[PDB]
Design a protein around this ligand. Structure first.
Ligand SMILES: Cc1cc2nc3c(=O)[nH]c(=O)nc-3n(C[C@H](O)[C@H](O)[C@H](O)COP(=O)(O)OP(=O)(O)OC[C@H]3O[C@@H](n4cnc5c(N)ncnc54)[C@H](O)[C@@H]3O)c2cc1C
Length: 459
């Protein structure tokens, strides 16, 4: 499949934000011709199942089909749409009533804002009328792993894509011990996924990270400590306060040495230590990068320049209510991609509907979050005993979708000038609209125990 020479809507990157933008454009303009250029070989797909439900299938073909069961058992594909949804890129200009094409395996390597043109890595030039940059980010490694040999680098997975799921799943069945580096939500999800597999196969899983507890940069100490206990109980050797000094190879094994002197021998490493936004195009493009948050600096409408917008993990945007931010969440990619698509068809709307975050550690434990969430902010948490329905599985049986979008549950309010600017919900489902309204209203609350009643948390 070849690139057309001109396309009205050009979306750079073939992930969640681009897909959402394409759908939005087509809804606003039903004959739109939209080209997605994707360096990846895969059609657009959702990432969350890669660290969650794909690991909990009881089906040995899941690695081939990439159809997973949600916690409720409803089956679905990781792809947003099947191939039949798309048209060919070369035919895009001629198909009556347009369509969405994906040019896969192709990287945009130059942006020329003056001439409304991009150059691909094979040398093709495409002119556009409107352009969305939705390039997401690249997983970070550790300098310690960078300074190790090629052999250490070959046995380290920087977990992000379908191909990483497939390699790691195969590895999980071949080796004795896997070490996850990273204590955030992704690391902890992977630790639970691998912990589960290790129980059936009789293997080992280690999770190490610098913080005192799992998700300690986000959650208050009491819930981060509870979370660490939960991951341990999945049969994970959790090693907090761990800074990697060096990694080497010895007798076939990876040898990880910590600053504090502890040593881990393992067979493979998985890194989940965060993301670097993909801003290479800012150079040729003359586009501003945000030096505080990283990513492309765009306004409240996600606009960089007259006919260029940015969405998803790559966009540092102005939130009129909460201030300048950059967000790396699935629902944010959907919401921002959809908004950018509306704006590319003339809507001129600011980012207003707050996106949410969610994480599940198996079908029994879930977290949701919205707004400005950081364990350095002042927090007030209100907790209660969990009922039978306060878990991701029993929630998934209602919707029924796994893609969200004695204490066992609770709410945590994150405060700035004693207004709620962020909320985390622990095992409380189907209440994100209430959390969204609380943050939107921006009231000073006499009693956060009263607000907690809105989440069905009582005393
Ligand atoms: C394993 C995993 C699990 C996750 N789980 C959750 C979760 O449970 N909840 C949640 O809220 N969020 C989750 N996320 C985050 C969520 O998936 C991301 O926020 C979302 O994928 C961001 O979408 P995006 O389109 O901005 O970027 P991406 O999905 O990164 O897509 C960008 C695409 O553009 C391509 N590209 C980059 N540069 C170029 C170029 N120059 N030319 C052409 N193509 C290019 C990239 O290769 C990539 O394929 C998870 C992420 C991962 C990796």
């Amino acid at each position: 499949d070849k690139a057309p020479s001109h396309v009205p809507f050009l979306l750079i990157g073939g992930g969640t934000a681009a897909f959402a933008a394409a759908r939005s454009i087509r809804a606003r303009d039903p004959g739109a011709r939209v080209l997605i250029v994707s360096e990846d070989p895969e059609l657009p797909y959702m990432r969350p199942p890669l660290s969650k439900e794909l690991w909990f299938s009881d089906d040995p073909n899941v690695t081939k089909t990439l159809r997973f069961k949600q916690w409720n058992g409803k089956e679905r594909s990781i792809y947003f749409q099947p191939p039949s949804f798309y048209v060919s890129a070369q035919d895009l200009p001629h198909i009556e009533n347009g369509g969405v094409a994906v040019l896969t395996g192709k990287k945009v390597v130059q942006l020329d804002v003056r001439d409304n043109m991009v150059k691909l890595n094979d040398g093709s030039q495409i002119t556009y009328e409107k352009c969305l940059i939705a390039t997401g980010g690249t997983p970070r490694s550790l300098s310690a792993i960078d300074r190790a040999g090629a052999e250490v680098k070959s046995r380290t997975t920087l977990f992000r894509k379908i191909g990483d799921f497939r390699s790691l799943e195969k590895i999980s069945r071949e080796v004795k011990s896997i070490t996850i580096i990273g204590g955030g939500f992704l690391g902890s999800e992977l630790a639970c996924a691998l912990g589960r597999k290790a129980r059936a196969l009789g293997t080992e899983v280690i999770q190490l990270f610098p913080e005192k507890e799992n998700m300690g940069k986000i959650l208050p100490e009491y819930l981060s400590n509870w979370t660490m206990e939960k991951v341990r109980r999945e049969g994970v050797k959790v090693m907090p306060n761990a800074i990697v000094q060096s990694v080497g190879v010895s007798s076939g094994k990876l040898l990880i040495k910590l600053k504090d002197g502890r040593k881990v021998e393992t067979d493979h490493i998985v890194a989940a230590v965060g993301l670097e936004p993909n801003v290479e195009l800012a150079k040729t493009g003359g586009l501003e990068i945000d030096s505080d948050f990283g990513g492309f600096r765009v306004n409240a409408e996600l606009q960089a320049r007259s006919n260029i917008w940015v969405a998803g993990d790559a966009a540092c945007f102005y939130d009129i209510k909460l201030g300048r931010r950059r967000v790396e969440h699935h629902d944010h990619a959907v919401v921002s991609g959809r908004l950018a698509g509306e704006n590319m068809t003339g809507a001129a709307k600011p980012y207003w509907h707050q996106s949410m975050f969610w994480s599940d550690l198996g079908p029994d434990v879930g977290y949701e979050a919205i707004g400005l969430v950081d364990s350095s902010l002042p927090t007030v948490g209100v907790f209660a005993k969990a009922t039978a329905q306060d878990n991701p599985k029993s929630a998934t049986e209602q919707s029924g979708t796994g893609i969200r979008s004695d204490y066992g549950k609770g709410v945590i309010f994150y405060l700035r000038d004693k207004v709620v600017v962020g909320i985390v919900l622990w095992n409380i489902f189907n209440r994100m609209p209430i959390a969204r309204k609380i943050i939107k209203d921006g009231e000073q609350h006499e009693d956060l125990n009263e607000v907690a009643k809105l989440f069905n948390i009582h005393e």
